[PDB]
């Protein structure tokens, strides 16, 4: 059961635009069945980088791309959940990491991040809707304004309003 | 939980920067170390790796891994090193000579052949004669810095070798 290993985006699927890209679909019972086949890469003529579970049609859609891939777009739908394989979500930062989309959710001193959608412990104005494109989802370390410190978060410790996270540069020699 | 880590048998790490934090505890199994590291509970830092001492049954949790500056990889028969995948660079620089991630699937979705195995394909890419290149398990690797990036011998007898589909670090925003 490998589903908990993916980054989940609720109410989202992906569409191709460029009809050149390949997909694979199958009717199943549950979303974990999609996860298992993606993780194992069993019976897919490509590298599985993401999948969608359609809760209304009971279908897996397996993709050789993710939401960051050229020539693919997100589409809204209540019936869809998107699961992106973390092996294909860049886990290091470029520059100040304005574009960081990874799932690290703990600060440098080991404090669990507060969710962006929460005002507890800390009241703030970094609402997800105010920062579209910046993926202020769950409690992930982010740098929505591109400040010099790198990705950071409001902290779950009431005594520490915010702290930077410890995410490595992709390349610094 | 332990499967969100890359395992290196008979290996531990030693810090040469005395300021770097460490935490240890007597435990029962390596699984219990993985748990605490993943949940990051009671650790005053970001857990990036841990070692399990099988002789003393002790966890050693680290805010660093084998790619961090200020730490050394050392042989020890009683140690196993477990590195958190969120902190092993999952994109390619240049031709991917330094790629150490755990992707083991080719571009066309074929499971890689283990480097130590000679079935179905016979080869001279022996681990011992390629020290430093991390030719362990069936991971996509680029030991000679060849054009297409990391690749592997394939588990399909009709495809000797194929590149994998590991993105360049420059591919995305
Ligand atoms: O404390 C706040 O609401 C500002 C958030 C922040 C922390 C670091 C840079 O900006």
Author numbering:
A (entry chain B): 37 to 209
B (entry chain A): 38 to 210
Publication passage describing the model:
The growth/motility factor hepatocyte growth factor/scatter factor (HGF/SF) and its receptor, the tyrosine kinase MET, constitute a signalling system essential for embryogenesis and for tissue/organ regeneration in post-natal life. Two truncated forms of HGF/SF are produced by alternative splicing of the primary transcript: NK1 encodes the N domain and the first K domain (K1),16 while NK2 encodes the N, K1 and K2 domains. NK1 is a monomer in solution, but crystallises as a head-to-tail dimer and all available crystal structures of human and mouse NK1 yielded the same dimer. (c) The lysine-binding pocket of the kringle domain of NK1 is formed by a glycine loop at the top of pocket (E183 and G186), an aromatic “base” (W188) and sides (F162 and Y198), as well as a positively charged anchor at the bottom of the pocket (R197).
